[PDB]
Design a protein around this ligand. Sequence first.
Ligand SMILES: Cc1cn([C@H]2C[C@H](O)[C@@H](COP(=O)(O)OP(=O)(O)O[C@@H]3C[C@H](N)C(=O)[C@@H](C)O3)O2)c(=O)[nH]c1=O
Ligand SMILES: Nc1ncnc2c1ncn2[C@@H]1O[C@H](CSCC[C@H](N)C(=O)O)[C@@H](O)[C@H]1O
Ligand SMILES: [Zn+2]
Length: 405
Amino acid sequence: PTACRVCGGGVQEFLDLGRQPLSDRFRKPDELDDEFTYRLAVGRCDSCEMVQLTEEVPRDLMFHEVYPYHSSGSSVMREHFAMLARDFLATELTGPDPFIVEIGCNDGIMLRTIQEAGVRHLGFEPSSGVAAKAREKGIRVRTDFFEKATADDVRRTEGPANVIYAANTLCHIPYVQSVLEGVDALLAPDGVFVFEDPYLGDIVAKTSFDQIYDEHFFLFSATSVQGMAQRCGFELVDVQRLPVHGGEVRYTLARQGSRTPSAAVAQLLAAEREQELSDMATLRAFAGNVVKIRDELTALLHRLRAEGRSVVGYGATAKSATVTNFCGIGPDLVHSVYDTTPDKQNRLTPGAHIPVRPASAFSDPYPDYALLFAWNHAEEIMAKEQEFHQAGGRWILYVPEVHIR
Ligand SMILES: Cc1cn([C@H]2C[C@H](O)[C@@H](COP(=O)(O)OP(=O)(O)O[C@@H]3C[C@H](N)C(=O)[C@@H](C)O3)O2)c(=O)[nH]c1=O
Ligand SMILES: Nc1ncnc2c1ncn2[C@@H]1O[C@H](CSCC[C@H](N)C(=O)O)[C@@H](O)[C@H]1O
Ligand SMILES: [Zn+2]
């Protein structure tokens, strides 16, 4: 019976995805078939409604020198972050000597636009290989985790930040109270801490269980974020839904009572209450839907094999580790996975050990089917792979249901 990392309440489990490997560890084929594994299960705190995993993976096992995800590998995301940076430069970063700190800046996808605007900034990026990619672009980066002590150190030497921003990173951090204390130490009194992460309501609506894996400790909602803010001295003052990464919300927190919440905050809270989003029964219904997607996906993949059809995967997502390991999908059913990330290529996916090959290798003669693990990138990918579909190749999707098109 684990304690909520937000409030210390009791977390009741509703979904057990079993034994899983580290999602972003890609092994060379000659490596020992030994892997770290942990139990992936999700529950909901009884007191603040925060949905969260019940076993933490230690941060240094996930985030370190060879972390492989490079944010800038998607054109949609590069545009998405450039626009956000422009929005901040026009609103929160006006005035003299503004300062923005990004938590989890990766390869500098967002902070490049800030640096090109001449605005003082600091990225925190504890994964040193992508940190170096950002530094190559002229971005100032500390290769450290953001937490209370490193935030204090930055406030000491650099002064208060007008904006603290985190995308697809807050939800990865079980030590969220320490981060919030770091934000309290570092943020200007009239500043904002803005984060965007996969949204519980989209996960439940689309049965997108592959959004649950080691790096995604929290599945935030407006309800839980509002409670988390309030308990830590802040206030949820804006929310915006975003289509990226399968559906997100961007949450804006301010010091309590410094700004009046937008109507959007109340409207999203009322819709979550109306739709019973975080009620344990709704969350168990989702868990039941997850098993149905497993069973239909494996039935399909086995029928394809019996029918002599070839099947590959597209995108060696961290997400797909949950899919292949919960569903038991290995190279006998999905022969290769195609991906543009050099440090994932010529390696095997975690747990299931499917070989990953460069996306340039996905070409005539094409396979019959491609299981689309990077389904959040469907539009971008399929635009680049029209020749596959024109040839008669078909995509297998498992969100929001198993279907082929
Ligand atoms: C856009 C695109 C991606 N890809 C590959 C790149 C990358 O390995 C994968 C896409 O991964 P993506 O869905 O962005 O992210 P992911 O599920 O691996 O998760 C990672 C780790 C992290 N914890 C997280 O939350 C998100 C931001 O990024 O697909 C590709 O081969 N062709 C393409 O056109
Ligand atoms: N405490 C912490 N502080 C800052 N970055 C962190 C962190 N824990 C993990 N990370 C970084 O968080 C990132 C998550 S991936 C998200 C990268 C990027 N913001 C994007 O949206 O695409 C990784 O690069 C990881 O190294
Ligand atoms: Zn709680």
